Design a protein around this ligand. Structure first.
Ligand SMILES: *[C@@H]1O[C@H](CO)[C@@H](O[C@@H]2O[C@H](CO)[C@@H](O)[C@H](O)[C@H]2NC(C)=O)[C@H](O)[C@H]1NC(C)=O
Ligand SMILES: *[C@@H]1O[C@H](CO)[C@@H](O[C@@H]2O[C@H](CO)[C@@H](O)[C@H](O)[C@H]2NC(C)=O)[C@H](O)[C@H]1NC(C)=O
Ligand SMILES: *[C@@H]1O[C@H](CO)[C@@H](O[C@@H]2O[C@H](CO)[C@@H](O)[C@H](O)[C@H]2NC(C)=O)[C@H](O)[C@H]1NC(C)=O
Ligand SMILES: *[C@@H]1O[C@H](CO)[C@@H](O[C@@H]2O[C@H](CO)[C@@H](O)[C@H](O)[C@H]2NC(C)=O)[C@H](O)[C@H]1NC(C)=O
Ligand SMILES: *[C@@H]1O[C@H](CO)[C@@H](O[C@@H]2O[C@H](CO)[C@@H](O)[C@H](O)[C@H]2NC(C)=O)[C@H](O)[C@H]1NC(C)=O
Ligand SMILES: *[C@@H]1O[C@H](CO)[C@@H](O[C@@H]2O[C@H](CO)[C@@H](O)[C@H](O)[C@H]2NC(C)=O)[C@H](O)[C@H]1NC(C)=O
Ligand SMILES: *[C@@H]1O[C@H](CO)[C@@H](O[C@@H]2O[C@H](CO)[C@@H](O)[C@H](O)[C@H]2NC(C)=O)[C@H](O)[C@H]1NC(C)=O
Ligand code: NAG
Ligand code: NAG
Ligand code: NAG
Ligand code: NAG
Ligand code: NAG
Ligand code: NAG
Ligand code: NAG
Ligand code: NAG
Lengths: 424, 166, 198
């Protein structure tokens, strides 16, 4: 079929009608980013000329090719450790939550560690690790270096970042962590997105329930959907295929009488053996150069992803972002990092407008001949009475001189309406 | 069939006609002995990278050696870690900030001799959280942080015919 | 070792050039690495074979060099794009992006020229001295719920004040720095106090 680009929605635009949300939902969006790549390493002489003095001596006629290949792979491994360090080691101190997790109704048990098991990971992190040969590869001079930061250390970093975010808001990212009650921190985040504090406090129980439910939805989504962590699995698969391809190239003859170097040396004397070995060296060297080039390009892609993940860690977790769609879909409130195999998962908590209502609007109100404009919100009408309300949440208030300002007269503003401004 | 390796008794169920075996890598990993019909596994002789851990020559000529992915019983202050067998560094139970990375959470430093330790991720700080307590700064400092970024690279050029066929 | 980021780039390019030049001393299976010696000693039927071996090895070395330079150049381009972004957002403005323009709350930045690069001196505001205070989300005065307009409500243990969030500066709580929404029965943690109306 011809694909659809989405449902059509004609917006009911007019010069005097504004829609304003009367309710909202708390949404948690999952973003998965690769951070690191498996740190492979290949001994160029072992791969090309394993246990053979004659081949190694012939290989010396190609100069420094093996040295620069080993250097390139070493540089990749170092880069992977740097990528992990830049994404996760962004907190100076290891923060811990208090024993009594009273956060004003907000439940964080799904994202905080649960020490009942030997590895102090959270349940969501356990899901990520559970969702997402070595001898056969290793035997040809292809070793794998362990990451500098172990899974337990990544979990400890995410735990520290999360404890800081919950108990200190964004203050731990700019200097010394300052303790704050979590509803007050949420009040600051609501102010950040342009919603007043009383909206949060009056609806604190509803907001806490919506948050806890959304986290549960994330738990179920990860538990159910098999292809959710495809971004990390694809990286693992690409590296596994690259190693399998490199190893399989050793079975190629490349025009030689045999792919096995030992059989050539067992059967032939140097005047013929050198020709057969040169053919094997040329093919194996070309295969190794192809592998290294692919790893450098893939590593550059991983580096770009890791830089993005580090940027999101700084701007979405250690602060509150005003960049649209950078920290999830909606108005960003806060984010929580989670460790994942070779990567990071961000749970972005966003404010999303829900229920819709039409209202009549005007750019200004004409009271005594002076033009009154709203200081913080907009002027709305329900069809009979005029009120002033904050832009992102319908909360009508009587229009007074304390929430409006005066500039000019009624003859200049197009669309100004007549009404009464009260002066308590 | 010739090669170098370690011969062990195999638990592979070879069929009566099979004379040797191969791994996932398509390299020989098992052989049937031509005199007694025993199945042997062939593993390569132990190998791995050799890395030298060192403080600079301005401070000391003492070094430590990491045998990457090798057991400490095969190589001949000998510390076996996940990264490999580290020889010459004294293992301590005191954690510190990472200086020279070894791998798998292990770092090394020169403090005299070279020591190895599990790296610290930072000092612990339990925040005094409660439902009705807020900390507010009463003073401040002005900080200047230095960030260094590459902008350009040396503009080299090579004449391909001059280089190859001068 | 402070300027290691720029020195590493210089070193990588120097090593790449040294490696490329050193590849000319390799025989690649030829009788000699020197093209002039082959042409001085051999006639075309044998010289072409020896030269083809040298061409293959030198061409492979040059292709390897160019590929490494393209990958390194892409890395430098990414760094330069980041530096240009920081120049625009940290020097020609004030950023609200956490840790983008230094560690702390960004105030301003100053660029400095460096060999093949740029150094930014980021001037940030960092909170220093700490003090504990008792807090409340709202104050109940006449049965109405009062919320702070710009700061937070704090107490030193006996008196309640309103202060800006990032610097302790207690002020008397008045109707000019608070707003009223709803009553005292909805806000969890509301405390009783007096709001003054000058
Ligand atoms: C705002 O939306 C929430 C849901 O996002 C509403 O809460 C639901 O209210 C209905 C009442 O009809 C209950 O049956 C549901 O169980 C509630 N769900 C939750 C999660 O609380 C809330 O009532 C809405 N408020 C307004 C004023 O419209
Ligand atoms: C915080 O959330 C967890 C799970 O998200 C809650 O634990 C569940 O509690 C119910 C009790 O009604 C049990 O039936 C579930 O089996 C529990 N699940 C798990 C995974 O433990 C926990 O009770 C919540 N805490 C609070 C204070 O509400
Ligand atoms: C627009 O809002 C005003 C304010 O609530 C409404 O006026 C009230 O209407 C109810 C009817 O249910 C009366 O009981 C109140 O006494 C009215 N208050 C005042 C101050 O007049 C008005 O009805 C709304 N108009 C529409 C079309 O919804
Ligand atoms: C808002 O109110 C003013 C009066 O306060 C309206 O001005 C009147 O306009 C008509 C039409 O031109 C004149 O005949 C009247 O003489 C005007 N009144 C006065 C006192 O001069 C104005 O039209 C109103 N605007 C709207 C949109 O209703
Ligand atoms: C705020 O901090 C500054 C330093 O960051 C304080 O200035 C110092 O005050 C002491 C007084 O005991 C002097 O000995 C130092 O020489 C001052 N240093 C500088 C750089 O001025 C300042 O007093 C602090 N203010 C408050 C109110 O605590
Ligand atoms: C909280 O702040 C108030 C305001 O400064 C303090 O009240 C003053 O205390 C001093 C004692 O040194 C008296 O000399 C003043 O006359 C008091 N002023 C008023 C308006 O009462 C109060 O002592 C502080 N409380 C604590 C526990 O620090
Ligand atoms: C804040 O003040 C109100 C009174 O202004 C307190 O309400 C009293 O609560 C007790 C316990 O339920 C009742 O016995 C009294 O009759 C209430 N007073 C009135 C006038 O009705 C309220 O408890 C205070 N809150 C706090 C936290 O101290
Ligand atoms: C607003 O009015 C339009 C009619 O132009 C209607 O289509 C739309 O559904 C209305 N919105 C609400 C929330 O009632
Ligand atoms: C708004 O649009 C309507 C047409 O739907 C028009 O009649 C009216 O004059 C417009 N109002 C203003 C202030 O332009
Ligand atoms: C010689 O090889 C045959 C092969 O079947 C085997 O049966 C026999 O036992 C072998 N003899 C000795 C002395 O190894
Ligand atoms: C390095 O060694 C020189 C002596 O050759 C000495 O002057 C200098 O202070 C040393 N620097 C450090 C950092 O140890
Ligand atoms: C090294 O060999 C010993 C056997 O003596 C074994 O117990 C140990 O687990 C081995 N360690 C590793 C890392 O393979
Ligand atoms: C660390 O402490 C334990 C005691 O719990 C001890 O058995 C072990 O030998 C110590 N390790 C080192 C390297 O001193
Ligand atoms: C605040 O109170 C806690 C006690 O829970 C204490 O550990 C901390 O040092 C206090 N902070 C200051 C700045 O006095
Ligand atoms: C705040 O926490 C304490 C427990 O330390 C509790 O006694 C008190 O009732 C709580 N206050 C509110 C308003 O929940």
């Amino acid at each position: 079929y011809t694909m659809s680009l989405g449902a059509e929605n004609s917006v009911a635009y007019s010069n005097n009608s504004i829609a304003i949300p009367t309710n909202f939902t708390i949404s948690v969006t999952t973003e998965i980013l690769p951070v690191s790549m498996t740190k492979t390493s290949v001994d160029c002489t072992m791969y090309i000329c394993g246990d053979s003095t004659e081949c190694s001596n012939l290989l010396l006629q190609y100069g420094s090719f093996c040295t620069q290949l080993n250097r390139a792979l070493t540089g990749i491994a170092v880069e992977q450790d740097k990528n992990t360090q830049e994404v996760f080691a962004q907190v100076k101190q290891i923060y811990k939550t208090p024993p009594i997790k009273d956060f004003g109704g907000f439940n964080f048990s799904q994202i905080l560690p649960d020490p009942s098991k030997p590895s102090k990971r959270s349940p969501i992190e356990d899901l990520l690790f559970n969702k997402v040969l070595i001898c056969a590869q290793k035997f040809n001079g292809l070793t794998v270096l362990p990451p500098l930061l172990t899974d337990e250390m990544i979990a400890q970093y995410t735990s520290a970042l999360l404890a800081g975010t919950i108990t200190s808001g964004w203050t731990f990212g700019a200097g010394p962590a300052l303790q704050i009650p979590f509803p007050m921190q949420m009040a600051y985040r609501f102010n950040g997105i342009g919603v007043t504090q009383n909206v949060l406090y009056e609806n604190q129980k509803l907001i806490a329930n919506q948050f806890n439910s959304a986290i549960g939805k994330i738990q179920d989504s990860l538990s159910s959907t098999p292809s959710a962590l495809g971004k990390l699995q694809d990286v693992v698969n690409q590296n596994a295929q690259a190693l399998n391809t490199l190893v399989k190239q050793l079975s190629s003859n490349f025009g030689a009488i045999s792919s096995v170097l030992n059989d050539i040396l067992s059967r032939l004397d140097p005047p013929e053996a050198e020709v057969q070995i040169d053919r094997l060296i040329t093919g194996r060297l070309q295969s190794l150069q192809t592998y290294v080039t692919q790893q450098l390009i893939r590593a550059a892609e991983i580096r770009a992803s890791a830089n993005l993940a580090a940027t999101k860690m700084s701007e979405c977790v250690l602060g509150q972002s005003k960049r649209v769609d950078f920290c999830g879909k909606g108005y960003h409130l806060m984010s929580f990092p989670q460790s994942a195999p070779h990567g990071v998962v961000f749970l972005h908590v966003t404010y999303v407008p829900a229920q819709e209502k039409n209202f009549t609007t005007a750019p200004a109100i004409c009271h005594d001949g002076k033009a009154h404009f709203p200081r913080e919100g907009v002027f709305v009408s329900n069809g009979t009475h005029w009120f002033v309300t904050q832009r992102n949440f319908y909360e009508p208030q009587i229009i007074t001189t304390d929430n409006t300002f005066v500039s000019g007269n009624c003859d200049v503003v197009i669309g100004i309406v007549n009404n009464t401004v009260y002066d308590p | 069939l010739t090669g170098t390796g370690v011969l062990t008794e195999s638990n592979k169920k070879f069929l009566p006609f099979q004379q040797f075996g191969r791994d996932i890598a398509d390299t020989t990993d098992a052989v049937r002995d031509p005199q007694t019909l025993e199945i042997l596994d062939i593993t390569p002789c132990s190998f791995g990278g050799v890395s030298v851990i060192t403080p600079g020559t301005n401070t000391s000529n003492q070094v430590a050696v990491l045998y990457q992915g090798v057991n400490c019983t095969e190589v001949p202050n000998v510390f076996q870690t996940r990264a490999g067998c580290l020889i010459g560094a004294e293992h301590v139970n005191n954690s510190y900030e990472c200086d020279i990375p070894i791998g798998a959470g292990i770092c090394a430093s020169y403090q005299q001799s070279i020591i190895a330790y599990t790296m610290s991720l930072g000092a612990e700080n339990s925040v005094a959280y409660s439902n009705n307590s807020i900390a507010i700064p009463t003073n401040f400092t002005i900080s200047v942080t230095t960030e260094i970024l590459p902008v350009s690279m040396t503009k080299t050029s090579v004449d391909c015919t001059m280089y190859i066929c001068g």
